[PDB]
Design an enzyme around this catalytic site. Structure first.
Site: not given
Ligand code: PRO
Ligand SMILES: [Zn+2]
Ligand SMILES: C[C@@H]1CCc2cc(F)cc3c(=O)c(C(=O)O)cn1c23
Ligand SMILES: C[C@@H]1CCc2cc(F)cc3c(=O)c(C(=O)O)cn1c23
Ligand SMILES: C[C@@H]1CCc2cc(F)cc3c(=O)c(C(=O)O)cn1c23
Ligand SMILES: C[C@@H]1CCc2cc(F)cc3c(=O)c(C(=O)O)cn1c23
Ligand code: PRO
Ligand code: PRO
Ligand code: PRO
Ligand SMILES: [Cl-]
Ligand SMILES: [Cl-]
Lengths: 336, 339
Positions: B290-291, B300
């Site tokens: 994640h990092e 995010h």
């Molecule tokens: O999960 C997300 O951030 C992307 C944006 C559109 C739908 N999926």
């Molecule tokens: Zn984060």
């Protein structure tokens, strides 16, 4: 640009450079008193080695470089040639183990007191305790004046070479790995045999110990111990070596069953032998592995299979090269 | 005739002998347990390199459908697989003293809170023919048994080698199986996107640093860590690599890690900008991934199953096409190159 300084080479220097060698290889400069040798280093992808389950990786230079490396978690080796003489830089990671290894290699030279000891043996610093040792094996043997020791598939087939540390013997990982590397490279050098076989060396301890100093009796007992060993059940078609640091009676370096391994008929632990692993006798395992693959004594004094110990590590006999390659599945029509 | 691993007695030697037999062409291995069987085609991971204090650690992968990975060092071995959406790890140390210490370390949080079905979350494995030979941990079941606090985040012809230099924080103790699992998950989160193994090969190294965070605050801690890299004589000439300060635990407010967003690009990396901090504890897989995601520019994501979801989820892969394009472009990829 990457380099190894032979005046201060340590385990960390060798490990960081060799761990950076990717699939495409890497140029490394060996630097010695103002003179440099550029080597193109590659991972050896044909041979696998475990010593008591510790993974050991091999590295090769180009053919013109005559340079090889060994890397384990506990030690590293650089080996190259100068005037045909074999020179090794041996570096252990732990301070206690490096100190013990440096004393082990220095002790024979302390009994005598040669004026040219530095070119045969040298502790390398960088500086209270050594970071590696340099040994020129050809020069060391002349100073120590030792006794004269005597004697196509889509995927390659994996052949295990099961090495067994004799009961009561101490073997040193840099020395055992060097014997294994030289043995495997003596086979791949013949008829492009990397297409047919990939050698996988493993090292374990056995309860077996030779009942006397006699090599013939010792090998009879070793082959019989394999047939009675419950851990060896299901592996009677592999290659076996009993290893020790020392030699047998009459300064015999090793012994094996002649022409005892064929990729199609291997069985009953027939492909077995015994070998010294001491640094001063490189190529003994290679010579015995050649004998197991059917190679006879050669007449060229520069052949690995010459009846007397020579220090040469390659098969030169065309008759022996054909016997060994045929026992590993090769045919003349396949080429090299 | 097919090679198999008996999970009721799996030891370091069992895992090492099987994984050391995996050649360039791969090998089928059957994973066996009571009421369980899985045939996996295992391959050497030839893209990632790992040294922990110069000790070589090798990674192994199953096929995508096998949901199985392995780790092998001289001192330890890990088998990790997913079963019914739960991550299960078998951790085996070679030395008896170290295996005993590791088994006690993982058992201690459970002994305080005795749950009825503790066996499905944590179990010491013993040899069939007495000290344990491995431990089994189902992280998803372990979290439901333990009363853990909610840890979260703050609201070319040849591939290019990129080093990920991990530094063991002064005064911290990290375990090799735990650190390696975070590194494996981080590297696999990158290669899973746009065939990125063609552009980059990640090389992880672990050393100890004199730096320690001056407080429990993650923001202050990262400021100090990046400043310590600029003052470190050992880091001279390596300001264009990726860096992580690692510890076992978390920071204030149960923060799992932190990093400089969009701080690594293969063409402009410099001044130790691509730096972050990460926990390595087993119960929070994917924190380093994640990092590393954030450092490569991923924002995010809104899908709760995305590795980049704002809250800690346990998922290990990028699902956002926008993030996958940002990460791949920072590693030299272009849409015309395909996957
Ligand atoms: O999960 C997300 O951030 C992307 C944006 C559109 C739908 N999926
Ligand atoms: Zn984060
Ligand atoms: C091979 C050389 C020395 C060891 C080394 C350790 C490390 F953490 C990073 C690098 C490293 O980044 C590097 C390079 O130039 O890309 C070369 N080496 C490194
Ligand atoms: C099971 C493995 C390969 C076959 C083998 C032959 C043998 F003669 C001795 C051993 C052996 O000693 C061994 C071990 O783990 O100690 C493992 N094997 C052996
Ligand atoms: C992978 C399996 C267990 C480990 C092992 C050790 C060894 F010394 C030899 C073999 C081995 O020879 C073998 C095979 O069937 O070819 C399989 N294994 C071996
Ligand atoms: C030289 C090598 C790669 C760069 C590096 C960055 C850093 F922040 C710390 C270290 C470092 O601590 C180290 C060591 O051997 O202990 C080696 N390297 C480091
Ligand atoms: O390789 C190293 O860095 C240390 C120095 C002496 C023994 N091993
Ligand atoms: O893996 C092995 O063989 C041993 C058993 C317990 C500790 N390590
Ligand atoms: O958000 C994304 O990019 C993926 C692909 C379509 C829906 N989820
Ligand atoms: Cl299970
Ligand atoms: Cl299948």
């Amino acid at each position: 640009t990457a380099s190894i300084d032979l005046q201060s080479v340590s385990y960390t220097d060798l490990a960081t450079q060799l761990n950076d060698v990717s699939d495409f290889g890497k140029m490394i400069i060996l630097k010695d008193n103002g003179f440099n040798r550029q080597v193109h280093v590659s991972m050896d992808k044909r041979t696998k080695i475990q010593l008591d389950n510790e993974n050991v990786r091999l590295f090769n230079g180009r053919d013109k470089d005559s340079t090889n490396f060994i890397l384990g978690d506990e030690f590293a080796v650089l080996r190259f040639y100068r005037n045909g003489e074999s020179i090794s830089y041996i570096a252990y990671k732990e301070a206690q183990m490096m100190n013990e290894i440096a004393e082990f290699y220095a002790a024979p030279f302390k009994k005598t007191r040669a004026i040219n000891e530095k070119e045969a043996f040298e502790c390398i610093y960088d500086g209270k305790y050594p970071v590696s040792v340099k040994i020129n094996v050809d020069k060391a043997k002349k100073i120590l004046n030792l006794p004269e020791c005597d004697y196509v598939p889509s995927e390659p087939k994996t052949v295990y070479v099961i090495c067994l540390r004799e009961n009561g013997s101490t073997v040193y990982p840099n020395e055992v790995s060097a014997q294994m590397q030289d043995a495997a490279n003596s086979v791949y050098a013949v008829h492009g045999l990397k297409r047919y076989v990939n050698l996988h060396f493993v090292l374990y301890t056995t309860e077996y110990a030779c009942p006397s100093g006699n090599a013939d009796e010792g090998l009879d007992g070793f082959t019989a111990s394999l047939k009675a060993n419950p851990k060896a059940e299901g592996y009677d078609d592999q290659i076996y070596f009993l290893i020790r640091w020392g030699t047998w009676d009459n300064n015999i370096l090793g012994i094996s069953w002649l022409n005892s391994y064929n990729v199609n008929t291997a069985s009953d632990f027939k492909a077995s032998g015994m070998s010294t692993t001491q640094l001063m006798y490189p190529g003994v395992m290679a010579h015995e592995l050649g004998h197991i693959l059917g190679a006879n004594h050669a007449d060229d004094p520069k052949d690995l299979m010459y009846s007397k110990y020579t220090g040469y590590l390659f098969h030169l006999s065309e008759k022996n090269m054909d016997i060994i390659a045929k026992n590993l599945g090769w045919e003349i029509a396949d080429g090299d």
